[PDB]
Amino acid sequence: MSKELLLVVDAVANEKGVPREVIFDAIEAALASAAKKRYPDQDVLARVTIDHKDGTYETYRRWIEEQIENPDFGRIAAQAAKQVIVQRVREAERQQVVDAWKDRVGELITGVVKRAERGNIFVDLNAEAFIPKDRVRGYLAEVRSEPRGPQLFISRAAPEFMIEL
Protein backbone atom coordinates (compact mmCIF):
# COMPACT_ATOMS: atom_id res chain seq x y z
CA MET A 1 0.00 0.00 0.00
CA SER A 2 2.24 2.78 -1.33
CA LYS A 3 0.18 4.58 -3.99
CA GLU A 4 -3.11 4.38 -2.06
CA LEU A 5 -1.77 6.98 0.37
CA LEU A 6 -0.19 8.87 -2.55
CA LEU A 7 -3.70 9.43 -3.94
CA VAL A 8 -4.69 10.89 -0.53
CA VAL A 9 -1.77 13.20 0.36
CA ASP A 10 -1.83 14.69 -3.18
CA ALA A 11 -5.04 16.63 -2.41
CA VAL A 12 -4.80 20.40 -2.77
CA ALA A 13 -6.82 21.19 0.38
CA ASN A 14 -3.80 21.54 2.69
CA GLU A 15 -0.93 21.28 0.16
CA LYS A 16 -1.54 24.60 -1.62
CA GLY A 17 0.33 26.97 0.69
CA VAL A 18 2.87 24.59 2.24
CA PRO A 19 3.74 21.37 0.33
CA ARG A 20 3.44 17.75 1.49
CA GLU A 21 6.62 17.72 3.62
CA VAL A 22 4.91 18.72 6.88
CA ILE A 23 2.02 16.33 6.16
CA PHE A 24 4.62 13.56 5.82
CA ASP A 25 6.15 14.64 9.14
CA ALA A 26 2.66 14.55 10.70
CA ILE A 27 2.11 11.02 9.36
CA GLU A 28 5.53 9.95 10.67
CA ALA A 29 4.79 11.49 14.08
CA ALA A 30 1.39 9.78 14.25
CA LEU A 31 2.87 6.39 13.36
CA ALA A 32 5.68 6.97 15.88
CA SER A 33 3.06 7.73 18.54
CA ALA A 34 1.19 4.56 17.55
CA ALA A 35 4.39 2.50 17.81
CA LYS A 36 5.15 4.10 21.19
CA LYS A 37 1.63 3.28 22.41
CA ARG A 38 1.99 -0.30 21.17
CA TYR A 39 5.33 -0.79 22.94
CA PRO A 40 5.24 -0.86 26.77
CA ASP A 41 8.47 1.18 27.07
CA GLN A 42 7.85 4.57 25.43
CA ASP A 43 10.84 6.79 26.22
CA VAL A 44 12.64 7.33 22.88
CA LEU A 45 11.52 8.82 19.57
CA ALA A 46 10.73 6.62 16.57
CA ARG A 47 11.54 7.55 12.97
CA VAL A 48 9.04 6.61 10.25
CA THR A 49 11.09 7.26 7.11
CA ILE A 50 8.92 7.82 4.03
CA ASP A 51 10.51 8.94 0.77
CA HIS A 52 9.34 11.72 -1.54
CA LYS A 53 6.40 10.78 -3.82
CA ASP A 54 6.85 7.01 -3.44
CA GLY A 55 5.34 6.12 -0.06
CA THR A 56 7.54 3.32 1.29
CA TYR A 57 6.07 2.63 4.74
CA GLU A 58 8.84 1.49 7.10
CA THR A 59 9.11 2.01 10.86
CA TYR A 60 12.40 2.42 12.73
CA ARG A 61 13.31 3.05 16.37
CA ARG A 62 16.34 5.03 17.54
CA TRP A 63 17.38 5.04 21.20
CA ILE A 64 21.97 5.51 17.88
CA GLU A 65 19.44 2.95 16.66
CA GLU A 66 18.57 0.06 18.98
CA GLN A 67 15.98 -2.25 17.39
CA ILE A 68 13.19 -2.44 14.83
CA GLU A 69 9.49 -1.72 15.40
CA ASN A 70 6.35 -3.49 14.21
CA PRO A 71 2.85 -2.09 13.59
CA ASP A 72 -0.52 -3.55 14.55
CA PHE A 73 -4.22 -2.73 14.25
CA GLY A 74 -4.44 -0.32 17.19
CA ARG A 75 -7.93 1.21 17.44
CA ILE A 76 -6.81 3.25 20.46
CA ALA A 77 -3.63 3.89 18.46
CA ALA A 78 -5.87 4.97 15.57
CA GLN A 79 -7.66 7.47 17.83
CA ALA A 80 -4.32 8.74 19.18
CA ALA A 81 -2.94 9.04 15.63
CA LYS A 82 -6.12 10.90 14.62
CA GLN A 83 -5.76 13.51 17.37
CA VAL A 84 -2.01 13.96 16.73
CA ILE A 85 -2.80 14.28 12.99
CA VAL A 86 -5.43 16.98 13.48
CA GLN A 87 -3.20 18.81 15.99
CA ARG A 88 -0.27 18.78 13.54
CA VAL A 89 -2.60 19.87 10.72
CA ARG A 90 -3.73 22.80 12.90
CA GLU A 91 -0.07 23.62 13.65
CA ALA A 92 0.83 23.45 9.94
CA GLU A 93 -2.10 25.69 8.98
CA ARG A 94 -1.06 28.19 11.66
CA GLN A 95 2.47 28.07 10.22
CA GLN A 96 1.05 28.58 6.71
CA VAL A 97 -0.97 31.64 7.67
CA VAL A 98 1.90 33.17 9.67
CA ASP A 99 4.52 32.68 6.94
CA ALA A 100 2.12 33.90 4.24
CA TRP A 101 1.58 36.94 6.49
CA LYS A 102 5.24 37.50 7.40
CA ASP A 103 7.20 36.58 4.25
CA ARG A 104 5.10 37.74 1.28
CA VAL A 105 5.00 41.50 2.05
CA GLY A 106 4.27 43.71 5.04
CA GLU A 107 2.13 46.41 3.41
CA LEU A 108 -1.50 47.29 2.57
CA ILE A 109 -3.77 44.27 2.09
CA THR A 110 -6.87 43.94 -0.08
CA GLY A 111 -9.76 41.65 0.81
CA VAL A 112 -13.52 41.33 1.16
CA VAL A 113 -15.55 41.35 4.36
CA LYS A 114 -17.04 38.10 5.67
CA ARG A 115 -18.48 38.77 9.15
CA ALA A 116 -19.36 41.88 11.14
CA GLU A 117 -19.82 41.77 14.91
CA ARG A 118 -20.80 44.59 17.29
CA GLY A 119 -18.06 47.16 16.77
CA ASN A 120 -15.84 44.78 14.78
CA ILE A 121 -15.64 42.99 11.43
CA PHE A 122 -13.74 40.18 9.72
CA VAL A 123 -11.89 40.71 6.42
CA ASP A 124 -11.12 37.62 4.35
CA LEU A 125 -7.84 37.90 2.43
CA ASN A 126 -7.70 31.16 3.38
CA ALA A 127 -6.64 33.57 6.13
CA GLU A 128 -8.92 35.70 8.29
CA ALA A 129 -8.10 39.23 9.44
CA PHE A 130 -9.49 41.56 12.09
CA ILE A 131 -10.91 44.99 11.28
CA PRO A 132 -9.69 47.47 13.92
CA LYS A 133 -11.14 50.97 14.26
CA ASP A 134 -8.78 52.31 16.95
CA ARG A 135 -14.44 45.14 1.28
CA VAL A 136 -11.62 47.36 2.56
CA ARG A 137 -8.01 48.15 1.66
CA GLY A 138 -6.60 49.65 4.84
CA TYR A 139 -2.86 49.73 5.49
CA LEU A 140 -2.01 48.17 8.86
CA ALA A 141 0.44 45.43 9.83
CA GLU A 142 0.91 43.86 13.27
CA VAL A 143 1.66 40.44 14.73
CA ARG A 144 -0.13 39.13 17.83
CA SER A 145 -2.42 36.30 19.08
CA GLU A 146 0.15 33.50 19.26
CA PRO A 147 -2.33 30.92 20.67
CA ARG A 148 -4.96 29.55 18.25
CA GLY A 149 -2.80 30.49 15.26
CA PRO A 150 -1.24 33.88 14.54
CA GLN A 151 -3.43 36.10 12.37
CA LEU A 152 -2.67 39.37 10.60
CA PHE A 153 -4.31 42.59 11.81
CA ILE A 154 -5.49 45.31 9.43
CA SER A 155 -7.56 48.45 10.01
CA ARG A 156 -10.48 50.20 8.33
CA ALA A 157 -9.02 53.69 8.89
CA ALA A 158 -5.29 54.31 9.23
CA PRO A 159 -2.93 57.22 8.48
CA GLU A 160 -0.65 54.85 6.54
CA PHE A 161 -3.50 54.22 4.09
CA MET A 162 -3.81 57.97 3.53
CA ILE A 163 -0.02 58.33 3.23
CA GLU A 164 0.20 55.53 0.65
CA LEU A 165 -2.72 56.88 -1.40
Partner: protein
Protein backbone atom coordinates in the same frame (compact mmCIF):
# COMPACT_ATOMS: atom_id res chain seq x y z
CA UNK B 1 -21.16 22.19 9.99
CA UNK B 2 -22.16 25.81 10.56
CA UNK B 3 -22.20 26.89 14.22
CA UNK B 4 -25.83 27.63 15.10
CA UNK B 5 -26.80 29.62 18.18
CA UNK B 6 -28.80 27.60 20.71
CA UNK B 7 -31.15 30.59 21.40
CA UNK B 8 -30.69 30.24 25.16
CA UNK B 9 -27.57 32.35 25.66
CA UNK B 10 -26.45 35.59 24.04
CA UNK B 11 -22.85 34.27 23.66
CA UNK B 12 -23.06 30.63 22.58
CA UNK B 13 -22.62 28.54 19.44
CA UNK B 14 -23.23 24.86 18.82
CA UNK B 15 -22.38 22.30 16.15
CA UNK B 16 -23.57 18.69 16.08
CA UNK B 17 -21.89 16.09 13.86
CA UNK B 18 -22.48 12.42 14.64
CA UNK B 19 -23.94 12.76 18.17
CA UNK B 20 -21.01 14.98 19.26
CA UNK B 21 -21.86 18.57 20.18
CA UNK B 22 -19.14 21.19 19.64
CA UNK B 23 -19.78 24.19 21.91
CA UNK B 24 -17.61 27.30 21.65
CA UNK B 25 -17.64 30.62 23.51
CA UNK B 26 -16.85 33.68 21.40
CA UNK B 27 -15.49 37.02 22.57
CA UNK B 28 -17.25 40.28 21.65
CA UNK B 29 -14.40 40.99 19.21
CA UNK B 30 -15.20 37.68 17.47
CA UNK B 31 -12.38 35.43 18.69
CA UNK B 32 -13.28 32.05 20.17
CA UNK B 33 -12.21 31.83 23.82
CA UNK B 34 -12.79 28.14 24.61
CA UNK B 35 -14.05 25.14 22.66
CA UNK B 36 -14.94 21.65 23.87
CA UNK B 37 -16.69 18.53 22.58
CA UNK B 38 -19.50 16.79 24.47
CA UNK B 39 -20.63 13.26 23.64
CA UNK B 40 -24.04 11.71 24.32
CA UNK B 41 -23.40 8.03 25.11
CA UNK B 42 -21.01 8.83 27.97
CA UNK B 43 -23.74 10.56 30.00
CA UNK B 44 -26.69 8.30 29.15
CA UNK B 45 -29.28 10.88 30.18
CA UNK B 46 -30.76 14.12 28.86
CA UNK B 47 -30.78 16.67 31.78
CA UNK B 48 -27.25 15.67 32.82
CA UNK B 49 -26.12 16.67 29.32
CA UNK B 50 -28.16 19.89 29.67
CA UNK B 51 -26.51 20.54 33.05
CA UNK B 52 -23.06 19.88 31.56
CA UNK B 53 -23.58 22.30 28.66
CA UNK B 54 -25.12 24.91 30.99
CA UNK B 55 -22.24 24.66 33.49
CA UNK B 56 -19.66 24.86 30.69
CA UNK B 57 -21.40 27.97 29.32
CA UNK B 58 -21.80 29.57 32.76
CA UNK B 59 -18.27 28.96 34.07
CA UNK B 60 -16.53 29.86 30.79
CA UNK B 61 -17.88 33.35 30.21
CA UNK B 62 -21.67 33.59 30.30
CA UNK B 63 -22.46 37.30 30.46
CA UNK B 64 -26.24 37.21 29.95
CA UNK B 65 -29.23 35.07 28.94
CA UNK B 66 -30.87 36.74 25.94
Amino acid sequence: NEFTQISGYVNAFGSQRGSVLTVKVENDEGWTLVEEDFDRADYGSDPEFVAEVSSYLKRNGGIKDL
